[PDB]
Write a protein that binds this ligand. Structure first.
Ligand SMILES: *[C@@H]1O[C@H](CO)[C@@H](O[C@@H]2O[C@H](CO)[C@@H](O[C@@H]3O[C@H](CO)[C@@H](O)[C@H](O[C@H]4O[C@H](CO)[C@@H](O)[C@H](O)[C@@H]4O)[C@@H]3O)[C@H](O)[C@H]2NC(C)=O)[C@H](O)[C@H]1NC(C)=O
Ligand SMILES: *[C@@H]1O[C@H](CO)[C@@H](O[C@@H]2O[C@H](CO)[C@@H](O[C@@H]3O[C@H](CO)[C@@H](O)[C@H](O[C@H]4O[C@H](CO)[C@@H](O)[C@H](O)[C@@H]4O)[C@@H]3O)[C@H](O)[C@H]2NC(C)=O)[C@H](O)[C@H]1NC(C)=O
Ligand SMILES: *[C@@H]1O[C@H](CO)[C@@H](O[C@@H]2O[C@H](CO)[C@@H](O[C@@H]3O[C@H](CO[C@H]4O[C@H](CO)[C@@H](O)[C@H](O)[C@@H]4O)[C@@H](O)[C@H](O)[C@@H]3O)[C@H](O)[C@H]2NC(C)=O)[C@H](O)[C@H]1NC(C)=O
Ligand SMILES: *[C@@H]1O[C@H](CO)[C@@H](O[C@@H]2O[C@H](CO)[C@@H](O[C@@H]3O[C@H](CO[C@H]4O[C@H](CO)[C@@H](O)[C@H](O)[C@@H]4O)[C@@H](O)[C@H](O)[C@@H]3O)[C@H](O)[C@H]2NC(C)=O)[C@H](O)[C@H]1NC(C)=O
Ligand SMILES: *[C@@H]1O[C@H](CO)[C@@H](O[C@@H]2O[C@H](CO)[C@@H](O[C@@H]3O[C@H](CO)[C@@H](O)[C@H](O)[C@@H]3O)[C@H](O)[C@H]2NC(C)=O)[C@H](O)[C@H]1NC(C)=O
Ligand SMILES: *[C@@H]1O[C@H](CO)[C@@H](O[C@@H]2O[C@H](CO)[C@@H](O[C@@H]3O[C@H](CO)[C@@H](O)[C@H](O)[C@@H]3O)[C@H](O)[C@H]2NC(C)=O)[C@H](O)[C@H]1NC(C)=O
Ligand SMILES: *[C@@H]1O[C@H](CO)[C@@H](O[C@@H]2O[C@H](CO)[C@@H](O[C@@H]3O[C@H](CO)[C@@H](O)[C@H](O)[C@@H]3O)[C@H](O)[C@H]2NC(C)=O)[C@H](O)[C@H]1NC(C)=O
Ligand SMILES: *[C@@H]1O[C@H](CO)[C@@H](O[C@@H]2O[C@H](CO)[C@@H](O[C@@H]3O[C@H](CO)[C@@H](O)[C@H](O)[C@@H]3O)[C@H](O)[C@H]2NC(C)=O)[C@H](O)[C@H]1NC(C)=O
Ligand SMILES: *[C@@H]1O[C@H](CO)[C@@H](O[C@@H]2O[C@H](CO[C@@H]3O[C@H](CO)[C@@H](O)[C@H](O)[C@@H]3O)[C@@H](O)[C@H](O)[C@H]2NC(C)=O)[C@H](O)[C@H]1NC(C)=O
Ligand SMILES: *[C@@H]1O[C@H](CO[C@@H]2O[C@H](CO)[C@@H](O[C@@H]3O[C@H](CO)[C@@H](O)[C@H](O)[C@@H]3O)[C@H](O)[C@H]2NC(C)=O)[C@@H](O)[C@H](O)[C@H]1NC(C)=O
Lengths: 284, 235
């Protein structure tokens, strides 16, 4: 029977565990005069497992632009979240992480929220930024004198809207001038072409299957199914669609057509989840 | 994934893998010629350098990457759904742009998308796939694993997992007896249902409490509520 151990065997002095990370919060919602602010200890480092919320406030009708003078954070473990509304719904818009310079962020409303997410290891110096606000900083002014603005803001008088080819360096004219109008579903509708700004059909003087399939392909759908007009109701500047030796379509406007009608096309769906596995069929 | 069975050649041509750092980290699905759909939760901090992301097409076997049946690809642009919070794990869907156009073959096929007013009723078997861990402790470096799970109503999903609001933006699929799950390792796997003999895309794998835990199924995000956003730039 072991006995006589009348000594303090646990000679080691216990130490409190590094628990309770919680958060430091840091600066909160501020107006325009407040521009420059450190996260919590930006010149030196930031605490691990710290969550902070920075809200940028601007006058109604204005937007907010970011400019990170110094941005040196950890790896993909730590990220920075950007929000605009923070009332009922917010959009990420831009998320920044990792060391190195980052691009500017333009708010879509008169409010911006900045969030910090940190891990428990690899703490870096931090980041800082300031804002100046303004009127449509990220939205270029549309050009007057009948100029059409693209997605990225480039404005041209008329070199787009379904021409022979896109005369735009940006080339953001993804939307076409042919869409299904007055239809019943996504795949069913009336053919409506637009030369410049006016929607019109393509008549049925020489309508064939090849041009129907070409139109269906231009609509992002499959082959032509159930190609038959019913009755005419439009009265716009109707054009003529005719077969061509090449793969392009030619629209010739003419309001003196005979037996005008609106053509209803039901284009089939495109390629879908059709399995092509080669397996034996069990005769059961 | 967990408790699944080995797939056949060409069984899931619309499932593709995403490689970052040299190892598979998240799954994705092929929709258009140069776009993919993947869970936004996994690709959150790695979207600033798409050049380091490698897109693998037809990764039926993880041991063959340079095989002729596998077409390597690179990621050019990564788009994350704006309405993402990482706090409620809501709208965890992301779209990735392929650098070059991808041809369609027998083993590489696109997938359908839900249409308007197209809701799958609860109680229907739906297929899942992924290269994640099948035993919750080990690793998966073998053939693609496939499984089928039934759709569960969100009313029971909230009760069985009293941790999130769930709401109507999530769809839960699994078995009350447990043993089948796909929320470990590869969280980018798609939720696939069968509407007619054409197949459809139902959801994308999302956060899951624990695999094979009794009455603890996974969570999926309804693509039917993101169809407009996907088609806005599907082209
Ligand atoms: C698209 O498809 C529809 C069928 O779904 C097709 O039918 C047209 O529908 C519109 C309404 O959507 C009809 O317009 C009405 O016509 C009656 C006829 O007398 C008018 O009295 C109505 O006048 C009302 O609206 C005016 C303007 O808002 C008001 O000023 C007025 O006080 C009345 O409140 C109304 O205009 C239309 O008659 C039918 N039929 C036809 C042949 O248009 C429609 O034609 C299709 N579209 C195209 C471009 O073909
Ligand atoms: C993905 O699939 C596409 C096909 O949809 C494929 O495009 C092909 O690219 C090659 C190389 O750029 C094109 O070149 C052909 O090469 C053969 C070799 O003998 C020639 O015979 C071809 O000439 C015929 O085809 C021309 C049309 O391209 C005709 O104008 C000509 O008169 C001849 O009939 C041609 O030079 C080939 O044409 C395309 N295929 C097409 C356009 O259908 C692409 O390479 C695939 N990508 C990958 C990564 O596999
Ligand atoms: C961001 O911008 C802020 C706004 O410009 C800056 O905060 C302001 O800093 C000035 C510095 O002088 C403070 O001026 C003082 O204001 C107090 C106000 O009275 C206080 O006491 C009453 C009770 O009697 C209390 O009700 C008030 O709320 C105040 O707490 C004066 O008494 C002083 O004499 C002096 O003028 C501003 O008060 C202060 N604003 C606010 C809202 O506190 C800030 O420094 C900028 N930077 C950062 C990092 O925030
Ligand atoms: C993943 O990559 C692996 C490469 O490391 C693939 O392994 C190869 O798989 C093929 C089948 O797809 C095997 O080919 C078989 O070869 C045997 C015998 O080899 C004969 O080869 C020639 C004819 O080509 C003949 O002249 C010789 O005398 C041999 O008799 C054949 O009987 C089979 O029918 C089949 O053709 C390779 O042997 C095999 N290589 C290795 C190193 O294992 C693997 O298949 C890939 N994964 C998938 C799913 O395909
Ligand atoms: C946050 O505050 C800083 C304060 O420095 C603002 O920096 C500003 O940056 C612009 C560059 O975009 C500076 O203009 C520069 O002027 C020099 C003059 O020689 C010229 O050589 C450069 O090519 C450039 O045009 C500007 O001077 C500078 N501000 C000050 C006071 O020096 C920054 O813009 C602020 N952030 C935001 C979002 O406004
Ligand atoms: C669209 O369909 C109409 C159907 O009326 C086509 O109208 C006529 O089509 C003929 C095709 O042979 C055109 O050629 C003419 O043939 C007669 C045959 O004897 C010949 O004598 C004429 O000298 C002429 O070559 C004809 O010009 C045309 N128009 C008429 C008869 O007024 C129309 O051609 C079709 N559209 C296209 C682009 O094919
Ligand atoms: C697709 O959904 C059907 C629902 O009809 C599933 O079929 C059911 O599968 C379970 C096992 O997962 C069967 O439970 C056991 O089946 C054995 C053999 O019949 C029986 O002796 C046991 O008492 C127990 O019921 C069940 O019978 C079977 N059928 C029904 C009507 O529930 C099926 O598993 C789902 N998945 C696939 C890939 O088909
Ligand atoms: C959507 O699902 C329906 C079933 O609800 C599919 O229709 C089925 O199509 C197959 C293929 O032709 C039919 O098989 C054939 O049946 C006839 C007898 O009707 C037989 O003589 C042939 O040898 C062949 O076996 C099947 O009967 C038919 N089922 C129906 C109409 O109820 C339809 O194909 C599916 N859609 C797509 C796009 O796959
Ligand atoms: C246009 O789209 C419709 C979609 O409803 C296609 O309709 C298909 O119709 C068939 C019905 O044909 C069958 O023929 C069997 C004998 O071969 C007969 O036993 C059976 O009872 C039935 O009459 C149906 O099976 C398909 O499911 C329908 N859908 C599809 C996608 O095929 C129609 O064929 C399409 N037309 C064109 C030209 O594309
Ligand atoms: C998970 O959902 C939580 C829901 O709790 C309640 O949600 C309602 C929705 O608007 C809040 O407003 C109420 O709306 C009622 C009508 O539907 C009114 O009768 C009521 O007076 C009130 O205006 C309500 O404040 C809120 N709380 C309570 C105690 O009712 C929500 O609170 C959580 O934030 C959400 N979790 C998230 C978003 O992560």
């Amino acid at each position: 029977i072991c006995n006589g151990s009348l000594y303090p065997e646990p000679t080691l002095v216990p130490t409190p565990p590094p628990e309770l990370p919680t958060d430091c919060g840091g600066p909160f919602e501020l107006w325009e005069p407040n521009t420059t602010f450190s996260s919590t200890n930006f010149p030196n480092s930031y605490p691990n497992l710290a969550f902070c919320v920075w809200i940028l406030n601007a006058q109604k009708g204005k937007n907010i632009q970011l400019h990170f003078q110094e941005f040196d954070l950890a790896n993909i473990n730590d990220v920075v979240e950007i929000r605009d509304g923070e009332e009922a719904d917010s959009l990420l818009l831009a998320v920044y992480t990792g060391p190195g310079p980052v691009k500017d962020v333009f708010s879509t409303t008169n409010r911006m929220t900045v969030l910090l997410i940190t891990n428990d290891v690899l703490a870096r110096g931090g980041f800082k930024a300031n804002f100046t606000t303004g009127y449509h900083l990220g939205i270029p002014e549309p050009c007057k004198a009948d100029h059409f603005q693209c997605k990225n803001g480039e404005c041209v008088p008329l070199v787009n809207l379904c021409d022979g080819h896109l005369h735009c360096e940006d080339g953001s004219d993804e939307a076409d001038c042919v869409r299904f109008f007055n239809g019943t579903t996504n795949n069913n509708g009336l053919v409506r072409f637009r030369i410049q700004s006016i929607w019109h059909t393509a008549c049925a003087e020489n309508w064939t299957t090849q041009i129907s399939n070409d139109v269906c392909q231009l609509l992002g759908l499959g082959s032509g199914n159930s190609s038959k007009p019913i009755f005419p109701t439009d009265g716009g500047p109707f054009v003529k669609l005719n077969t061509a030796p090449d793969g392009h379509l030619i629209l010739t406007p003419s309001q003196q057509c005979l037996q005008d009608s609106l053509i209803r096309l039901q284009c089939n769906h495109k390629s879908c989840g059709k399995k092509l596995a080669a397996q034996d069929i069990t005769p059961k | 994934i967990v408790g699944g069975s080995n797939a056949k050649e060409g069984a899931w041509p619309w499932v593709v893998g995403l490689y970052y750092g040299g190892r598979l980290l998240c799954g994705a699905s092929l929709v258009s010629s140069d776009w993919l759909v993947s869970a936004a939760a996994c690709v959150y901090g790695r979207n600033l350098e798409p050049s380091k992301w490698t897109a693998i097409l037809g990764l039926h076997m993880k041991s063959n990457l340079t095989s002729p049946q596998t077409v390597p690809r690179l990621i050019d642009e990564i788009v994350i759904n704006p309405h993402y919070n990482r706090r409620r794990k809501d709208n965890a869907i992301a779209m990735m742009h392929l650098e070059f156009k991808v041809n369609y073959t027998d083993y590489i096929q696109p997938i359908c998308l839900p249409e308007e007013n197209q809701v799958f009723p609860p109680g229907r078997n739906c297929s899942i796939a992924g290269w994640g861990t099948v035993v919750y402790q080990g690793t998966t470096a073998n053939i693609l694993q496939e499984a089928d799970v039934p759709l569960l109503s969100n009313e029971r999903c909230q009760q069985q997992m009293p941790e999130y609001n769930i709401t109507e933006n999530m769809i839960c699929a699994g078995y009350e007896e447990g043993g089948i799950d796909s929320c470990q390792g590869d969280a980018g796997g798609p939720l696939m249902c069968q509407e007619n003999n054409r197949w459809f895309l139902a959801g994308v794998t999302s956060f899951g409490y624990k695999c094979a835990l009794p009455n603890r199924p996974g969570v999926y995000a309804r693509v039917s509520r993101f169809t407009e956003w996907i088609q806005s730039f599907l082209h």
